Amino acid sequence: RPRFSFSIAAREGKARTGTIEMKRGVIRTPAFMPVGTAATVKALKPETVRATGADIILGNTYHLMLRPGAERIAKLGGLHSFMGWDRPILTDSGGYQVMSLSSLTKQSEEGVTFKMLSPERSIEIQHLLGSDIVMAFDECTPYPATPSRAASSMERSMRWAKRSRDAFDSRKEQAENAALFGIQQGSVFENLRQQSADALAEIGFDGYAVGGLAVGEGQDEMFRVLDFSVPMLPDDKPHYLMGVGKPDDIVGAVERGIDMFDCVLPTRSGRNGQAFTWDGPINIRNARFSEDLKPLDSECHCAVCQKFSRAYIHHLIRAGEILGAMLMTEHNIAFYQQLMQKIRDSISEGRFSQFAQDFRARYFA
């Protein structure tokens, strides 16, 4: 396989379905990436992640650079070997979590110091991990932001995008075997989104993320921004909506041209008791499930729904049992992959608009 090749097999409106070929495997798009925090997709063996249909996972860099450390992971053979996942991994840059999870941060044009992470160091860490898709290092913009502050932040992020590109290209093994994505910023402002898209396309990347939209703005506003933002990106490269989202967010984002997604919702909310079903989410802790012998979802093909009842999982989650988290997480990740499969198939068959309508009618009934 090549280092990177994105091919679009079918289209419907702004929606696309296809494949990304990389050295470590093929990624079917639109794709959902389960999130690995601290070199594990929480409560799942990697074989179980694969059994749900995932082609690629996201690794959070911020935690790994702290524990066990990027140089240590490299010494041990890289993240793939360390965690037992041999397919593609996309790594975030670490910049978002440095701001949310650190203390005593100090920002500057060089990077961020916290209790330093620069564009150059972020790319090097992602190299040491052995990432297949490397994210440029950027300054995520708070929401809401004034136009002046959104512009300042976006401009710095574009300067940082060039530094990330040059750092990646300087390292032969990384440039030859991995891919690099740039991140569009600009908050909710069309002119800033356009300037950011233009800057990123001038530098040139293997794929383009829409950054800064998993920030509490609400679905209507997210969709309004995607409406004008996604068409600004190069059509022939993947479009990655970072940090999104709920099932209906994913469907609407695909309708607007997004090809890749990641979120902690299926894993984190699974451990909390929320299960996704075609008839909407349920909270398995609710007393109404204590004697319900049906599986989490009537149609789901996952290994949990073939074997275990709502009543049993209700008991496990109420009791704080590890198996409860295991079963909820496997089901939820499987549900997300089944959603992506239905999206891909419906685009291929030219019936995605109908699928989205049917999906919403039943999910929100």
Binding residues for substrate: 92-96, 138, 185, 212
Residue type, 185: Q
Dist CA 285 CA 213 (whole Å)? 31
> Quick one: which of 348, 335, 356, 322 has its CA closest to 44?
322
The structure tokens listed for 194 are 């356009």
Q: Which partner, a second copy, Zn ion, Cl ion, none, binds residue 264 by CB below 5 to 8 Å per kind?
A: Cl ion
**Residues with Cβ < 8 Å from 321, sequence gap 6 or more?**
none
The residue range among 18-26, 73-81, 151-159, 229-237 that interacts with a second copy, by the rule CB under 8 A, is 73-81
Binding residues among 257-286 for Cl ion as defined by CB under 5 A: 264, 267-268
Residue 92 annotated among the catalytic residues of the structure: yes
Least Å distance, CB 310 to a second copy, is: 11
CA atoms within 13 A on the CB side of 14: 19
Q: Which partner, a second copy, Zn ion, Cl ion, none, binds residue 267 by CB below 5 to 8 Å per kind?
A: Cl ion
The residue range among 127-135, 186-194, 256-264, 298-306 that interacts with Cl ion, by the rule CB under 5 A, is 256-264
Binding-residue pattern over the window 346 to 365 for a second copy, x denoting contact by CB under 8 A: --------------------
Q: Which of 24, 28, 318, 360 binds a second copy (CB under 8 A)?
A: 318
Residue 297 annotated among the catalytic residues of the structure: no
Q: Which of 166, 198, 235, 321 binds a second copy (CB under 8 A)?
A: 321
Binding residues among 32-51 for Cl ion as defined by CB under 5 A: 42
Sort strands 133-135 and 89-91 into parallel, antiparallel or unpaired.
parallel
Q: Which partner, a second copy, Zn ion, Cl ion, none, binds residue 331 by CB below 5 to 8 Å per kind?
A: Zn ion
Q: Which of 57, 305, 325, 333 binds Zn ion (CB under 5 A)?
A: 305
Dist CA 314 CA 328 (whole Å)? 10
53-66: string of b/e by CB count within 10 Å (b at 16+)?
bbbbbbbbbbbbbe
Helix or strand holding residue 181 (H, E): strand 179-184
